[PDB]
Design a protein around this ligand. Sequence first.
Ligand SMILES: Nc1ncnc2c1ncn2[C@@H]1O[C@H](COP(=O)(O)OP(=O)(O)O)[C@@H](O)[C@H]1O
Ligand SMILES: [Cl-]
Ligand SMILES: [Mn+2]
Ligand SMILES: [Mn+2]
Ligand SMILES: [Mn+2]
Length: 534
Amino acid sequence: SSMSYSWTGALITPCGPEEEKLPINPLSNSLLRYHNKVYCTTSKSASQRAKKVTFDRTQVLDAHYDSVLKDIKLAASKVSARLLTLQQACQLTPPHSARSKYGFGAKEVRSLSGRAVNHIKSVWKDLLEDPQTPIPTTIMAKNEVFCVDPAKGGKKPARLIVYPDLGVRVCEKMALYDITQKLPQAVMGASYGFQYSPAQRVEYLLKAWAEKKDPMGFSYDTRHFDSTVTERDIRTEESIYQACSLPEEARTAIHSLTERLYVGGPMFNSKGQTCGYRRCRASGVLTTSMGNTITCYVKALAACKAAGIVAPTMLVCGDDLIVISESQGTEEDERNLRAFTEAMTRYSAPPGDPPRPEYDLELITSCSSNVSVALGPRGRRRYYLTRDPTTPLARAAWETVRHSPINSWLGNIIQYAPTIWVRMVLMTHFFSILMVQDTLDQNLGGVNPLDLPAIIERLHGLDAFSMHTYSHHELTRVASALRKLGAPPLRVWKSRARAVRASLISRGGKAAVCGRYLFNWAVKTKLKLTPLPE
RNA sequence: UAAAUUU
RNA sequence: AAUUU
Ligand SMILES: Nc1ncnc2c1ncn2[C@@H]1O[C@H](COP(=O)(O)OP(=O)(O)O)[C@@H](O)[C@H]1O
Ligand SMILES: [Cl-]
Ligand SMILES: [Mn+2]
Ligand SMILES: [Mn+2]
Ligand SMILES: [Mn+2]
């Protein structure tokens, strides 16, 4: 039936100028050598992304879908949700949010300026009065950094982002913010991934795995998910929203947003031209995550049922899914996954790479990450979350006139502190740099470098400073990512770490704590690291 | 562009 | 601010 997009042929223009790397990268030329491999997806590539996602969708539902959908609405009705005052919605707008066409931006919205509030007041009136006129959207190319991969095509084309004007974004929030906070967890219970921290995620997977007599695991992702979402899916999304108890004023707003925005509309490029028309998810609306998550969950739970997956325990985050079940033998397990995938394909969520049963927790990747294992200070197995370092390292070497990557280093150091690639590579580089520019006591992204051991202890446990004997997969992948980017191998970082450590300790104070906890892996004279007041 | 998590 | 989808 429905084509995901149609195109006037106008270009998908850039929303500003897209910075180029420079002939010297002074922050990262010590980190890695292959700067030619680090690139930023650009709007020039936007039309290739368009070709890849423009396609025809035929959806065939069935008893299993209908059944799961039914049960999900009974869940929805145990939910009470309120409108949000125009003001409360204004103040949830992020500080840099793209300004409105109508001559005001996010400063004004967040400070409740009167031109902003009056405009928004009328946009909301118009949603209540008019329940069908399509609402124009702006289409744009996302700039993200990656390492080139000649195996999978060289350079990825840019993701397409599609969004309404600021005034509309606020009204979305008035109608739906409260729902986004309550509904997903109500519908999906323990399966809703975003509710968990990373360490809860790991614990959840291990409990799931442990409780099977004979576990089997797999993951699924949908190829161009936003494109695979149909009008009917979006309307089914509405009817799930409507199954809650809601002010009538909300229902009309939901219904109107659904029909005027969510199921489709005209798209304008950044220079004002009509660009095309859209009959799938616009990634950029408030309901993107919740919508994706819920809809993925319906299809997936139905597909599980269509396929005989026994005692499934799910984790869903957007279009990213993990299922851990009772193996029915591998011959059956293969047949059932073939079936799972056929069902998802009938429901219009076809796979990027078709899935595969696995019987070892390390081999299951989802949300670009997986669980691994190492040994802790007393010899006990310590399970933790990790990922291929390729992208984080690439992003670590993105330096331009506008952008510095030091924040990226820190963010990864915190999130992935127990991994061998953060400990040996990023930490060493990060500290090495700040020491030399003598900027340790400074505050990056509202964090102080000198607080890290505390921060990491709070978050990952003290075992993060004493883990050893990392896995073959993980050693191989790290080694291999450093070779791919022209970074020193691990033995060299061992050396640089000793040096950094020594210099940090001689500095004394917090510095020295940093040096003793964060780099104990680097010495043979391993210390007895004790818990930290802070 | 939106959300979640971490901070 | 970081990361993810
Ligand atoms: N930067 C982003 N902004 C908004 N939505 C996003 C973003 N990245 C991913 N998503 C949403 O989640 C969906 C699944 O993401 P992913 O599997 O990572 O890519 P794909 O679109 O190729 O399936 C996307 O289609 C999109 O709707
Ligand atoms: Cl231990
Ligand atoms: Mn996907
Ligand atoms: Mn309706
Ligand atoms: Mn995905």
